[PDB]
Design a protein around this nucleic acid. Structure first.
Lengths: 64, 51, 146
RNA sequence: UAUAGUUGAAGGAUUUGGAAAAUUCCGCUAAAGAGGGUGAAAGCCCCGUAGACGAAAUGCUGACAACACCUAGGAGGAUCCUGAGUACGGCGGAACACGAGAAAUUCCGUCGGAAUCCGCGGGGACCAUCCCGCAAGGCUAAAUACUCCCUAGUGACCGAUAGUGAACCAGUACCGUGAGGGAAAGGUGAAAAGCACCCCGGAAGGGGAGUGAAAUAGAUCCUGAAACCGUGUGCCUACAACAAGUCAAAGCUCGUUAAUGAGUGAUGGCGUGCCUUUUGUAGAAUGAACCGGCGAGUUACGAUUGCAUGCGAGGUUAAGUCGAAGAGACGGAGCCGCAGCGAAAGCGAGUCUGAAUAGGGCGAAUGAGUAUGUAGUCGUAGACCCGAAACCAUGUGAUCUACC
RNA sequence: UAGCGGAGAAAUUCCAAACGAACUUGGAGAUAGCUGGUUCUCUCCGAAAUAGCUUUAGGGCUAGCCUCGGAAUUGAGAAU
RNA sequence: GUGUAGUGGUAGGAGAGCGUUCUAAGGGCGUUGAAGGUCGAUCGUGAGGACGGCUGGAGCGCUUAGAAGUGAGAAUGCCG
RNA sequence: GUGAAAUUUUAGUACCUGUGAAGAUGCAGGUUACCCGCGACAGGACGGAAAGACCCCAUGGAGCUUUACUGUAGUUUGAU
């Protein structure tokens, strides 16, 4: 049949134009009275996906 | 060329011959043979379908 | 080329790999798979992306975004596509297309400003980047949001 | 038109054979050179095929007759009709990709219960404007799915451990009270011409003679391998501790695909099988009694990378129609690339964040794809094969045994 | 008298030689991180038994170690 | 040609080849003996290939390309 | 006179002290020993029969208990 994509990842990942992927960081939904200001400021900026995982999930995101 | 069948009804010879109109000329039915006979009108007809 | 002398294009057909036919092929007795382990039963292997026990990547990072129900994306043609209609042809989001340039006008044709045009066409589309009108009226064309 | 049919072209001789269709000469026919059979392999011997003709009876399909049935305009808008315990609401469940969710739409059970054209339903909670329709009465061919059966065909499908379980008198023989389970078994030669007659022998069996091209083709009947069981003989062996061999070697007997030959072997040197699993094997860990036969990474649909081929800022068809189950053209709906950033409004070689022309993330600055074959890998599928103890749903059993 | 049961002067005893839940057919090629096996040949290169995390410890993912194909500057590798 | 250099190897990666059945075209063999069976002191680096003697009595090779129910000594394998 | 069975890698199947996956018919160094049988015994061939019943593991089962979790037949209460 047709290879099914993953509706669990498509709600967390945006595909850039050079090939990589985008992802918004973790540790940004809860208790902040612990993390400092640097620790909470520098976590408003999404980053990419490492070389590792793009080896193992390069198949579930085959289309989207 | 077309239904001038009186020229095909004499092509059940020794299999040295085989007959075909000008709409069914395929690859094999040419590559498999050595010489090819064709009337003068069939030549133009071929030169039509083949654009 | 005759029937009894066929030759394929060189380097265009490989052979095969039949595994488990004798210890000289290099792939007999565990079929290129090794020793025990659930990678080596019939139909072993875990699902994709699964990670032993770790909370996998897709649950370690958060969900975000939604999708507007009525977005509209156009069918951009930049500027050099136009540069073959020499001087006065009434470029149109219609039978212009009909030339092997732009099929499937998604929601109307946009026009952009990359990178250089020297003609005097007359452009009709459904949107324009502000620099594109300046380029057109720079070479002295027209425009119409039609 | 379906169920019986009729007609249907052209060859002789020679060499091998038991037998020619084989071989060599010289001829002929074809709208018929597809196939099957005959003493080996046939265009011209036989059945047929290409053609041409054909139904007393019965059935189906057309067509046109006859009969049956059905169907008319224009203008008016005073009053009447337009499907009731229905729509719909609460409550509890189900159906829609939609698991109550902000939940429209559709059903079911229970309770409550509308209006009547100035009217009613819907456009994914709900309201307003707009737009589209008229539920609570019925019928309706074709395009679609299947094949126990009959007819005619085909196959880079099998060829007696294969192919149906079953090529033969098979769902039989046999097993179980019963539901139920279920095998092994094809081949004489062209034609039985299947051995008259004699001899030993109670018979079986055998030896001559015969039939036969061939009886070592004689009914256990084409070919007839291996484990296993025998007969004869060239070389060695009764002071010897041998994973059973190989290297060295006297003598003895031979004489080949003719070459630095073959068989055997006194005597010396050296030497703890095979497979799997393990840090490690001769292991006293584990499997094989022996010979033969069968017996394990495949296919469809997707995805990705390398090789190759056709076009290249383009590539490219699908379903479907005519066609021999082909080829072989039509068919431009659709997909992929040519532009990106932003969650989004949007902006555009730029854009986002930000008070910012600051800085930073991301792309541009030449940067090529796409269709198909092929191969490596991965995904859904039983997916390399064999292997449980158990679980759920119809059935069958109290002739043994337990209670009555 | 019947298996989601029956019968038991009570033993987990009996229900067609085997009852802590009968037999027979179907879902069914059930499932097994476990065990056994997997057939022709030559040339070239050739490892590991480690760190991290895991309802993980004889399993798995990424990292390290192996192999094959390409790009580019090198002077980046090495042993003194 | 001639010099220099290298050639142990399990899991495993890479490359090139032997052999079986069938299809297509071309060219061949066969009662003056094909397939199959047995024996031989033969040839190539391998898988493997020829040639001759006997038995046997009707179909099979060779070249180029294609497709696979394509290769067996072990599963306390299954059948004789 | 008739006529089985379990078992079985091939066997021309000696003893001692060593050695070895840590107790050898088969290795090492020595000692004893002509070839083939027949009737008895059971020290050894980790002897044969049952892919440990003891123990651990399988993120395995089944049967049983309860103030383990989640539900339910059944009994009762209220509205309609």
């Amino acid at each position: 049949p047709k290879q099914k994509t993953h509706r669990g990842l498509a709600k967390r990942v945006k595909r850039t134009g050079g090939g990589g992927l985008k992802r918004g960081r973790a540790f940004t939904s809860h208790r902040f009275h612990g993390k400092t200001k640097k620790q909470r400021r520098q976590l408003r900026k999404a980053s990419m996906v490492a070389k590792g995982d793009y080896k193992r999930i390069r198949q579930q995101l085959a289309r989207m | 060329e077309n239904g001038n069948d009186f020229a095909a009804l004499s092509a059940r010879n020794l299999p040295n011959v085989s007959v075909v109109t000008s709409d069914n000329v395929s690859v094999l039915d040419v590559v498999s043979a050595n010489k090819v006979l064709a009337t003068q009108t069939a030549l133009t007809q071929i030169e039509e379908v083949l654009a | 080329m005759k029937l009894h002398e066929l030759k394929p294009a060189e380097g265009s057909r490989q052979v095969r790999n039949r595994v488990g036919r004798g210890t000289s092929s290099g792939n007999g007795k565990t079929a290129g798979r090794g020793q025990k382990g659930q990678k080596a039963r019939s139909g072993g292997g875990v699902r994709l992306g699964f990670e032993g026990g770790q909370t996998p990547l897709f649950r370690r990072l958060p969900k975000r975004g939604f999708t507007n129900i009525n977005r509209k994306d156009y069918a951009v043609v930049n500027l050099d596509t136009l540069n073959r209609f020499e001087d006065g042809t009434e470029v149109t989001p219609v039978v212009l297309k009909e030339a092997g340039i732009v099929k499937n006008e998604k929601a109307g044709i946009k026009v952009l400003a990359d990178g250089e045009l020297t003609k005097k066409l007359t452009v009709k589309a459904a949107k324009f980047s502000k620099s594109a009108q300046e380029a057109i009226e720079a070479a002295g064309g027209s425009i119409e949001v039609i």
